[PDB]
């Protein structure tokens, strides 16, 4: 302890002299007695001894921690708070205090200066580079942004992006639910307010997806994006006047929302936002099967793909209602460019539909194989 004090008094990079310090303590047999001696010698600080005494106090934790004498560390923490208050508070040594706080070890327990750094203009100064050799300083900065000082996202960006995404998503959901808290008839009068609220909710959801992206929350960003797309559809509804809407729809109301814009390119939004699965055969019984709007089917086709099994199954949905003579060509509206042999071959017999039968099974190169398609 005397030698350490003498070397410090003589001294009266920062990561370089750490070894010069430690290798002295290495001379000891069991470091606990050395820690006791160093703690006792710490009281020998000279008049105005600040710079050397900083390293002196710093060594106390580096000693007491590796062996974990809890009471010793407790008195050490008391010593650290005392160094902060009795001397450092009058010393105003910002850099020395910062280095000490870095060397806190129990920097998890640095409440005595935690708000001080922000009050000491260290909040943006917390973004000092080359001060995180192990990266823990920035992590503690993030922890402080989460707990000690929540709200100023600027210092947050300077220093969890998932936390920001969740907060923005919560704000967007609150904005979306505020409109739904009132009746549709009551809320329809304030159309401009609806458009503005939809714009704000869309911005909040976009920020949520972006902060999830900065958080690498790919699926969460996607969910925020789907919420934003629904909010934008409601924004057009409140702005372009589409009182036939789909936003904030329940499962039961999903079919009605699809009925708001029945065509596939017009009906995809309700299914996407509320994760609703339309009755492909039963719903498709009304898209083209009875109306012929295989243009809505083409909206689906450029939007998605329907299987041949669904093609042979849609006959059931068509037969499940009163199929007008129009309904035949209505379902077949998209049948020209098709190729399916076996399922259509069975279906034609299922209804004696000589139309497509003559359409396909007539070509000798094709009507010679219609036997293998149907009777084969």
């Amino acid at each position: 302890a005397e030698e350490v004090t003498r070397e410090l008094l003589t001294s009266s990079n920062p990561t370089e002299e750490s070894q010069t310090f430690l290798q002295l303590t290495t001379l000891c047999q069991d470091r606990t007695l050395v820690g006791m001696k160093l703690l006792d010698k710490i009281s020998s600080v000279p008049h105005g001894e600040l710079s050397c005494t900083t390293e002196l106090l710093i060594l106390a934790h580096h000693c007491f921690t590796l062996t974990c004498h809890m009471e010793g560390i407790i008195r050490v923490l008391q010593a650290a708070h005392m160094l902060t208050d009795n001397h450092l508070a009058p010393s105003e040594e910002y850099g020395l205090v910062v280095r000490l706080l870095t060397g806190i070890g129990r920097y998890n327990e640095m409440t005595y200066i935690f708000d001080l750094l922000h009050k000491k203009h260290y909040f943006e100064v917390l973004m000092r580079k080359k001060l995180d050799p192990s990266g823990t300083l920035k992590t503690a900065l993030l922890d402080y942004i989460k707990r000690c000082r929540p709200g100023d996202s600027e210092k947050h960006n300077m220093i969890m992006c998932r936390e920001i995404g969740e907060n923005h998503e919560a704000a967007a959901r609150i904005q979306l639910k505020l409109i739904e808290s009132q009746p549709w008839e009551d809320s329809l009068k304030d159309g401009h307010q609806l458009k503005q609220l939809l714009l704000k909710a869309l911005t909040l959801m976009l920020d949520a997806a972006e902060s999830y992206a900065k958080d690498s929350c790919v699926r969460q960003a996607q969910h925020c994006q789907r919420l934003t797309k629904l909010i934008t559809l409601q924004i057009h509804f409140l702005n372009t006047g589409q009182n036939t809407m789909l936003i904030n729809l329940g499962r039961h109301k999903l079919m009605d929302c699809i009925l708001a814009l029945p065509r596939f390119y017009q009906a995809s939004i309700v299914a996407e936002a509320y994760d609703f699965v339309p009755d492909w055969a039963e719903i498709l019984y009304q898209q083209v099967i009875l109306k012929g709007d295989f243009n809505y089917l083409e909206e689906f086709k450029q939007q998605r793909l329907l299987k041949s099994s669904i093609f042979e199954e849609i006959s059931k949905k068509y037969k499940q209602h009163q199929p007008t003579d129009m309904v035949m060509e209505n379902l077949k509206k998209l049948l020209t460019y098709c190729e399916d042999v076996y399922l259509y071959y069975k279906l034609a017999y299922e209804h004696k539909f000589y139309e497509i039968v003559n359409v396909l099974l007539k070509d000798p190169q094709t009507g010679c194989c219609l036997k293998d398609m149907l009777a084969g």
Partner: protein, 282 residues
């Protein structure tokens, strides 16, 4: 946890003199558990298990699923890997998750580290069934040559409503070969080349109606005469738009030079099944 480890070490210290091998095995396992406790402690999750809750295996896979629900793909993945809990399925799950978002380059980079393709070049099956699901999960949402780029943001609610009106123009205008030519199709085929084969590359372009480059690759990949037998005749028994098909078969070699048995084995599948009437034309 440091003191916990030290105490466990002392437990081993007292165990060494004991001479009970089974006791030593139990102690080593408990050491493993303490290490895993520390490993989890590196994460600081919403909830953590008891040691008795860790003293049982089932909870390992329990956490394997839980962290998957916790979206800690990297952290949970590393934890499970240290645990001896494999997470290639979690890698594919992350792949699908970014697929729902579009971190496709990073997703591909992470998935190549966990790529499990079928080495057999004749894989007429899922091969990597992960690829089998991923191909659909990707190609179900093709971005064709619509006029809207992947960087259009400020499109007002009117622009969005006009997009709703014009949505069908994105992929209907995408042509037959454009189904294969898409940069989206480029990515899908790249993933295929990563962990898939042509046996399904034919069908993927088939449901999107990409044929010419499909035949070009089929020759380039040497589609088997049995492949051009089944995947043609059985689809032909299901399609029969073969006006283009016999033409393309001749397009391989009009002089019957480089296009020998591809439809010959299909004719085996047909006439062996006594299907010959249009085999006359073929």
């Amino acid at each position: 946890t440091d003191i916990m480890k030290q105490l466990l070490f002392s437990a081993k210290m007292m165990f060494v003199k004991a001479g009970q091998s089974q006791d030593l095995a139990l102690c080593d396992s408990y050491i493993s558990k303490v290490d895993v406790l520390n490993i989890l402690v590196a994460a600081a999750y919403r909830h953590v298990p008891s040691l008795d809750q860790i003293l049982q295996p089932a909870a390992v896979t329990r956490l394997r699923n839980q962290l998957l629900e916790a979206e800690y793909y990297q952290l949970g993945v590393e934890v499970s890997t240290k645990t001896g809990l494999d997470t290639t399925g979690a890698w594919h799950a992350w792949g699908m998750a970014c697929l729902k978002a579009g971190n496709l380059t990073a997703a591909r980079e992470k998935f190549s580290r966990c790529l499990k393709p079928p080495f057999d070049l004749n894989q007429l099956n899922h091969g990597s069934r992960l690829v089998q699901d991923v191909v659909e999960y990707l190609e179900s949402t093709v971005r064709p040559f619509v006029s809207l780029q992947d960087d259009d943001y400020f499109a007002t609610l009117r622009e969005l409503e006009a997009t709703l009106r014009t949505q069908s123009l994105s992929l209907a205008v995408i042509p037959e070969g454009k189904i294969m030519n898409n940069t989206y199709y480029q990515e899908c085929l790249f993933y295929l080349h990563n962990y898939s084969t042509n046996l399904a590359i034919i069908s993927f372009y088939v449901r999107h109606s990409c044929l010419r480059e499909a035949l070009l690759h089929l020759l380039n990949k040497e589609s088997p005469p049995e492949v051009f037998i089944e995947g043609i005749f059985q689809p032909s028994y299901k399609s029969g738009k073969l006006h283009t098909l016999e033409n393309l078969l001749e397009s391989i070699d009009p002089t019957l030079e480089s296009w020998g048995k591809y439809l010959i084995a299909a004719c085996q599948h047909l006439q062996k099944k006594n299907y010959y009437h249009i085999l006359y034309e073929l």
